[PDB]
Design a protein around this motif. Structure first.
Motif, mmCIF file in Angstrom:
data_model
loop_
_atom_site.group_PDB
_atom_site.id
_atom_site.type_symbol
_atom_site.label_atom_id
_atom_site.label_comp_id
_atom_site.label_asym_id
_atom_site.label_seq_id
_atom_site.Cartn_x
_atom_site.Cartn_y
_atom_site.Cartn_z
ATOM 1 N N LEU D 30 0.820 -1.209 0.000
ATOM 2 C CA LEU D 30 0.000 0.000 0.000
ATOM 3 C C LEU D 30 0.856 1.262 0.000
ATOM 4 O O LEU D 30 0.599 2.201 -0.767
ATOM 5 C CB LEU D 30 -0.933 -0.003 1.210
ATOM 6 C CG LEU D 30 -1.541 1.332 1.638
ATOM 7 C CD1 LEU D 30 -2.697 1.720 0.733
ATOM 8 C CD2 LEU D 30 -1.993 1.262 3.083
ATOM 9 N N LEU D 34 1.431 4.347 -2.623
ATOM 10 C CA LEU D 34 1.260 5.747 -2.236
ATOM 11 C C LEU D 34 2.505 6.577 -2.535
ATOM 12 O O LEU D 34 2.399 7.696 -3.051
ATOM 13 C CB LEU D 34 0.898 5.844 -0.757
ATOM 14 C CG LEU D 34 -0.555 5.533 -0.401
ATOM 15 C CD1 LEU D 34 -0.782 5.713 1.088
ATOM 16 C CD2 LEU D 34 -1.500 6.410 -1.202
ATOM 17 N N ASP D 122 -2.804 1.696 7.942
ATOM 18 C CA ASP D 122 -3.708 1.651 6.797
ATOM 19 C C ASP D 122 -4.902 2.584 6.988
ATOM 20 O O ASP D 122 -5.363 3.203 6.021
ATOM 21 C CB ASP D 122 -4.157 0.210 6.530
ATOM 22 C CG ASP D 122 -5.084 -0.329 7.600
ATOM 23 O OD1 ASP D 122 -4.621 -0.534 8.741
ATOM 24 O OD2 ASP D 122 -6.273 -0.552 7.298
ATOM 25 N N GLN D 123 -5.391 2.726 8.225
ATOM 26 C CA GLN D 123 -6.403 3.740 8.511
ATOM 27 C C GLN D 123 -5.842 5.142 8.308
ATOM 28 O O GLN D 123 -6.548 6.042 7.834
ATOM 29 C CB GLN D 123 -6.922 3.579 9.939
ATOM 30 C CG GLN D 123 -8.094 2.631 10.080
ATOM 31 C CD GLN D 123 -8.310 2.190 11.512
ATOM 32 O OE1 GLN D 123 -7.367 2.108 12.297
ATOM 33 N NE2 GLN D 123 -9.558 1.902 11.861
ATOM 34 N N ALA D 125 -3.506 5.856 6.129
ATOM 35 C CA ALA D 125 -3.458 6.016 4.680
ATOM 36 C C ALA D 125 -4.831 6.352 4.113
ATOM 37 O O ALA D 125 -4.942 7.126 3.156
ATOM 38 C CB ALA D 125 -2.903 4.753 4.029
ATOM 39 N N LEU D 126 -5.888 5.764 4.681
ATOM 40 C CA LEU D 126 -7.242 6.086 4.236
ATOM 41 C C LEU D 126 -7.623 7.525 4.565
ATOM 42 O O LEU D 126 -8.209 8.222 3.729
ATOM 43 C CB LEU D 126 -8.249 5.122 4.860
ATOM 44 C CG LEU D 126 -8.900 4.100 3.931
ATOM 45 C CD1 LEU D 126 -10.025 3.378 4.652
ATOM 46 C CD2 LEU D 126 -9.415 4.775 2.673
ATOM 47 N N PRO D 129 -4.112 10.496 3.134
ATOM 48 C CA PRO D 129 -3.257 9.880 2.107
ATOM 49 C C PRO D 129 -2.068 10.732 1.700
ATOM 50 O O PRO D 129 -1.127 10.200 1.102
ATOM 51 C CB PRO D 129 -4.219 9.666 0.931
ATOM 52 C CG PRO D 129 -5.272 10.691 1.125
ATOM 53 C CD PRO D 129 -5.431 10.876 2.599
ATOM 54 N N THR D 130 -2.079 12.031 1.997
ATOM 55 C CA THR D 130 -0.951 12.908 1.714
ATOM 56 C C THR D 130 -0.208 13.325 2.977
ATOM 57 O O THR D 130 0.701 14.157 2.903
ATOM 58 C CB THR D 130 -1.421 14.148 0.950
ATOM 59 O OG1 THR D 130 -2.445 14.813 1.700
ATOM 60 C CG2 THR D 130 -1.966 13.758 -0.413
#
Lengths: 108, 51, 52, 150, 139, 126
Positions: D30, D34, D122-123, D125-126, D129-130
RNA sequence: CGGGACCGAGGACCGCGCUCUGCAAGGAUGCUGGCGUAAUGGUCACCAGCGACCCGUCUUGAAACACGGACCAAGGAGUCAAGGUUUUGCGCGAGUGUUUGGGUGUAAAACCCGCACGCGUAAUGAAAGUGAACGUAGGUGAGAGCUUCGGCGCAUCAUCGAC
RNA sequence: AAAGGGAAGCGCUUGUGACCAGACUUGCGCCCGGCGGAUCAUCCGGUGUUCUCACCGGUGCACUCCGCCGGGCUCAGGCCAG
């Protein structure tokens, strides 16, 4: 395990004073600093005391029950009166307990 | 709510009863931990040998 | 299956471990709107034409 | 022949984790995506630290997080790519939003009891995301017995 | 959750019971594996949506995964037998592989596998006799 | 069936790499061993001596493991083994394993003929 | 403007162009003949041209000397334990370590339990002994990342302070 | 079976002799003619599905589908060459 070793790869290429009869139990005095003093209180009662729902009671902490003989004075205390029972105490630890509003009781 | 699991009878048909799925079935699946523990555990019934 | 929850409640010193990943669906995570709406435009394709 | 006084240097940094954690592999996929598809340097730093070994990921405590939360950082999302531990010397936990690789049970309980939020990467990243409005924290690397004995 | 197709692929990508590894390639015995090759795209048991084709007595038999019955293996497969013209079989297989977004990347492989099975169901031609050659074989 | 169209198969070297002095000693097998003596002429690569194997002799990636017909060999033990080559008859040929009986060989050969898969050793045990 | 040699990597289209119905412009096509088998190709034996000291081992800088080798089969030499140390993976984390023992068992397995104890959580002194916040746990200069674009500043380094 | 004018063995490359592994034997597609059958299209009902796609039963009444056999044609096919 023998198959991971380098030998398998290399196959083919080869003062002061003396103290007689020292008893360590004479010198047993473990120490705890005052910044860990509230961690000896059980968690729910400690959170009640720190939140402020106990304005009429003071916790009495027996260090010898938890396995400590001396109260040292690293850190700071919240402004809550605490009774501390200890065999030994440092001057700064007593000073900080007295500022917090409690008292250091000497035990044996 | 938590998921359920069907209960089957002696004839192989559902009995109409369900059970709450235990929380251990949502645990992480970790083959590296499983392999390490199995490699350790399979050695524990060994009998010694020597010349 | 009824007793399994009490079995894992009775193990003292052990709790069921927390994972380092909350959502295991990598495709859902990658193709979600939240990630895709902030991405840069693609700089190429899966296959590259030979220039010279 | 070609006279090469200088030597071409092979890479001296990790390109992939040594770990066999499958969830770490999914997180690495992931964050590779990104870091490739975003301009954010936060994603590249997070990916590189996901590659790292354990002595290069020292634990971060709640008191360290509370220290770094001062002076205008109270509303930022704290990002740690190591274990977040509890500090019993810290008697009052401030409200915080922390995304970490993992939490100890007492640290997670105390954050949720103070009213903050606990997230995985991962949360993170959700939701970011930047990496916007984040506070990236590292633990004390040199606070190790081997490093003291060096 | 803790389980996904990506997670199952990470668990079973290095070894599973369907793997057949040799020097010239890695094959798979998976019934839901078109082209019988070991990859995440073709790992039908790994994937949430998957297709497999087996020979029938006449024609082909196509199995597809049902996504809502993944924990019920007895009722997890949607099974259709095509015993008709080959073009009709190819049309129906491409329809279930591409029309509703159910593994559109597998429709070429599915049509090719159906063609291979129907081609194998033809009568075989008798081979020419072996021609003896040289001196010792000829005499 | 005929193999898939491929680039010509080039072997950089067809001769084997014979071990030094195995032609003179019967206790030495011809299988290659790297000479590790400090004064060895083969190890030092004096001219007129045996060649040493190296990665420069490596075969083309597009034609590696290809037999001269253009197929890659796949070892099979039974009918279910040969049925794995259903989608690969233009790229893979079937080699029946040496310990398969004659009847099972007949079954494998019949199934491979139905599938259009070349069998490399189809004449054996007949 | 001729004459000759060696080579043809790639594999839908995309590009730069040109002499622009198309082309010699991001890599060979078109036409034709014989044969369709040991003809091509391969392996073995031998002749021919050219090339080519007998292997370890020792010594020193190196050679030479010296030592081992009649031949073949089978064994045949960096292992295990304890205690350190660095690095890798994993669990938990200011704690950690069930297995001395007890419980239990489908019985040398697996599962479960806890008091003590070990290491860590505090150091310093020969010892008696004493024992870690002036400050949002300090100031200054860097510093990834973030930023409301004013700054906030991780790890870490240098320096000055405090206990 | 072969070699041998004071060693043999080995490397590169032909040649001779002996002995061999492949490859090939035809495929796919159009146009006619002759057979043998209606799992041609549409519609109706039932069922399953990925909820719009399929399967099964009825309807085909032969300018439609599916196999087979005779011809013809295009393309692609093995080795060495000009």
């Amino acid at each position: 395990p023998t198959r991971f070793s380098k030998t398998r790869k290399h196959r083919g290429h080869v003062v002061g004073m003396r103290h007689f009869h020292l008893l360590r139990n004479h010198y047993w005095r473990p120490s705890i600093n005052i910044d860990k003093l509230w961690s000896l209180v059980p968690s729910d009662v400690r959170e009640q005391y720190l939140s402020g729902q106990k304005k009429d009671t003071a916790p009495v902490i027996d260090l010898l029950s938890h396995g400590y003989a001396k109260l040292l004075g690293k850190g700071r205390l919240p402004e809550i009166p605490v009774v501390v029972r200890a065999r030994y105490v440092s001057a700064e630890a007593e000073r900080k307990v007295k500022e917090a509003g409690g008292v250091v009781e000497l035990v044996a | 709510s938590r998921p359920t699991v069907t209960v089957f009878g002696a004839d192989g048909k559902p009995t109409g009863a369900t059970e709450v799925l235990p929380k251990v079935f949502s645990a992480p699946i970790r083959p590296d931990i499983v392999k390490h523990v199995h490699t350790g555990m399979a050695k524990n019934k060994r009998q010694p040998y020597a010349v | 299956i009824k007793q399994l929850d009490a079995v894992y409640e009775s193990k003292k010193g052990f709790f069921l471990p927390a994972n380092i990943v909350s959502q295991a669906d990598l495709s859902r995570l990658i193709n979600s709107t939240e990630i895709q709406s902030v991405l840069r435009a693609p700089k190429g394709e899966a296959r590259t034409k030979r220039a010279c | 022949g070609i006279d090469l006084r200088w030597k071409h240097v092979r890479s001296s940094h990790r390109k992939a984790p040594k770990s066999d954690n499958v969830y770490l592999k999914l997180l690495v996929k992931l964050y590779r995506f990104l870091a490739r598809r975003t301009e954010a340097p936060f994603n590249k730093v997070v990916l590189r630290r996901l590659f790292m070994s354990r002595i290069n990921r020292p634990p971060v405590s709640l008191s360290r997080i509370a220290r770094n939360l001062k002076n205008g950082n109270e509303k930022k999302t704290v990002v740690v790519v190591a274990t977040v531990t509890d500090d019993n010397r810290l008697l009052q936990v401030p409200k915080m939003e922390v995304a970490a690789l993992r939490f100890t049970a007492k640290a997670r309980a105390r954050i949720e009891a103070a009213g903050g939020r606990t997230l995985t990467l991962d949360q993170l990243a959700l939701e970011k995301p930047t990496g916007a409005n984040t506070l990236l924290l590292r633990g004390p690397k040199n606070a190790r017995e081997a490093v003291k004995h060096f | 959750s803790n389980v996904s197709a990506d997670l199952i692929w990470e668990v079973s990508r290095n070894y599973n019971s369907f793997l057949v590894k040799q020097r010239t390639g890695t094959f798979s015995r998976d019934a839901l594996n078109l082209t019988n090759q070991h990859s995440r795209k073709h790992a039908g048991f790994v994937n949430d949506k998957a297709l497999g084709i087996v020979p029938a007595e006449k024609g082909v038999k196509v199995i597809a995964k049902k996504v809502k019955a993944a924990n019920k293996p007895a009722s997890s497969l949607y099974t259709v037998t095509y015993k008709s013209t080959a073009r009709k079989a190819y049309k129906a297989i491409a329809s279930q592989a591409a029309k509703h977004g159910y593994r559109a990347d597998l429709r070429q492989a599915a049509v090719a596998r159906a063609s291979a099975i129907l081609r194998s169901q033809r009568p075989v031609k008798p081979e020419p006799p072996k021609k003896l050659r040289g001196a010792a074989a000829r005499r | 069936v005929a193999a898939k169209k491929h680039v010509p198969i080039v072997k950089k070297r067809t001769k084997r790499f014979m071990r030094h002095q195995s032609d003179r000693f019967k206790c030495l097998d011809s299988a290659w061993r790297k000479p590790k003596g400090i004064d060895n002429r083969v190890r030092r690569r004096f001219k007129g001596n045996l060649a040493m194997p190296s990665i420069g002799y490596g075969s083309n990636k597009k034609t590696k493991h290809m037999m001269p017909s253009g197929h890659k060999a796949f070892l099979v033990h039974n009918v279910k083994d040969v049925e794995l080559l259903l989608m690969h008859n233009r790229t893979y040929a079937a080699e029946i394993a040496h310990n398969v009986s004659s009847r099972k060989r007949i079954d494998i050969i019949t199934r491979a003929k139905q599938l259009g898969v070349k069998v490399t050793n189809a004449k054996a045990k007949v």
